[PDB]
Structure 1
Amino acid sequence: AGLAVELKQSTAQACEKAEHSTFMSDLLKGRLGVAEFTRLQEQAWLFYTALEQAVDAVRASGFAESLLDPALNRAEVLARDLDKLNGSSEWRSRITASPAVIDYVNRLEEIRDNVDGPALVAHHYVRYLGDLSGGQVIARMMQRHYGVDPEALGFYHFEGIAKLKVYKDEYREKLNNLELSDEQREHLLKEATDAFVFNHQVFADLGKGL
């Protein structure tokens, strides 16, 4: 009863486990630096590119159109942040995908090629709402601990979204307003737990140096 609530309760466990990753613990508690965080955003640009391709394909099908806000696009802003973070655009000629990111990218392409709307909304919820929530905390700890230029953190700032609290409330309303069959609803709820597992292994690779 209530998709936004049912999503938040089903993934509440994995969400708490997502803040406890070894890489993300060291990163926010001041133990790493600008270099390791730049590695995070380089993997992010890889699967955020594959995600928004799936978003574009699902949006063109007319599924969850109001939810797939283009103002949430992160790939270009990441490319603009990686230019500053690397001090040069020559990161594009040497990006590498850790195994878990490749596994994350393959699934997002699978959702794209199947135009799997409900599975897309699951990944859309897990990444973007995390960006609009924990990403605000991650962005602050980057400035506080490492003095990163606030303009190399544009990934965590949404220029189309002034009131983040209002928008996150508006986002959950569109989640509750989605017209999903019981088959679609379970498929979405399962992929959401899958989406957290995909991210968890991305951060396990980062902490392992893969």
Structure 2
Amino acid sequence: TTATAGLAVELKQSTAQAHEKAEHSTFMSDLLKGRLGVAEFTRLQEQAWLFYTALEQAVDAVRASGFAESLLDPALNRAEVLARDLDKLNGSSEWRSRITASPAVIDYVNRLEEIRDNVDGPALVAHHYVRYLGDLSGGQVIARMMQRHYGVDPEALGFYHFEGIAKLKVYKDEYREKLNNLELSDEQREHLLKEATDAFVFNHQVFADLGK
């Protein structure tokens, strides 16, 4: 890992091992190869609604503070569209009163709520990068596989569609440019990098708990 090439590159390299671990978790691997089904995908999306809700509250806090404002684009917010997807997948709003956070999600949500409470800009950016750039990347493959293997209606995959964003690759390139332009102290940078690994660790455990 190097830091002489900018934060975007340092992040990518520093978290590469943790990304591989999350991406290849047994649950996700089985889901994408067609071994599971829409029920398991819905369970994942229910857990995701819980942590996206926490994430987006933290994003609102940090954006309001003035830190990384241009990076924290509200067009990225997923909680509302995800709730609409869940309404479709489950057939009603029943899920809202039924779902419960897995142990993994309890931990993940707790950390996001701590970031929100502390208004910890560097830590929030780490979590924002891990989730949203993942959605704009691997997420696109997930959406296609839900349609292909399980026949999920595209209208129940709004989470992955990012209404309001035109060119996707251009958007990611601009996102990385914004990361590179963030004014961070060495301590803040170190904190952001460590947190990004922790974000991937939380995500792997979410998949593990779904697999149980």
Q: Is the shorter-chain TM-score for this pair beyond 0.5, marking a shared fold? A: yes
Answer with 87-96 or 27-36: which moved more: 87-96
Runs (5+) with no aligned partner, structure 1:
none
Deviation at residue 60 of structure 1 after TM alignment: 0.4
Runs (5+) with no aligned partner, structure 2:
none
**Residues of 2 paired with 1:71 and 1:162: CA distance?**
11
Deviation at residue 193 of structure 1 after TM alignment: 0.3
Q: What secondary structure does 1:88 align onto?
A: coil
Deviation by residue 1:20-70 (Cα, 9 ceiling, x = unmatched): 111001100000001000000000000000000000000000000000000
Q: What secondary structure does 1:93 align onto?
A: helix
Deviation by residue 1:146-196 (Cα, 9 ceiling, x = unmatched): 000000000001011111000010100000010101110000000000000
Deviation by residue 1:59-93 (Cα, 9 ceiling, x = unmatched): 00000000000000000010000000001111111
**Residues of 2 paired with 1:197 and 1:177: CA distance?**
26
Give the structure 2 partner of residue 87 of structure 1. 91
**Residues of 2 paired with 1:200 and 1:34: CA distance?**
20
Deviation at residue 15 of structure 1 after TM alignment: 1.0
Answer with 56-65 or 11-20: which moved more: 11-20
**Residues of 1 paired with 2:112 and 2:165: CA distance?**
25
**Residues of 2 paired with 1:136 and 1:62: CA distance?**
30
**Residues of 2 paired with 1:199 and 1:133: CA distance?**
15
**Residues of 1 paired with 2:19 and 2:110: CA distance?**
22
**Residues of 1 paired with 2:97 and 2:194: CA distance?**
36
- The percent of aligned pairs where both chains have the same amino acid is 100
Deviation by residue 1:83-113 (Cα, 9 ceiling, x = unmatched): 0000111111111110000000000000000
Deviation by residue 1:102-143 (Cα, 9 ceiling, x = unmatched): 000000000000000000000000000000000000000000
**Residues of 2 paired with 1:111 and 1:90: CA distance?**
30
TM-score, structure 1 as length reference: 0.98
Deviation at residue 16 of structure 1 after TM alignment: 1.4
Please give the root-mean-square deviation of Cα atoms over the aligned residues, in Å.
0.5
Superposition misfits of 4+ residues, deviation over 6 angstroms? none
Q: What secondary structure does 1:139 align onto?
A: helix
Give the structure 2 partner of residue 13 of structure 1. 17
Aligned residue pairs, count: 208
Q: What secondary structure does 1:67 align onto?
A: coil
Give the structure 2 partner of residue 44 of structure 1. 48
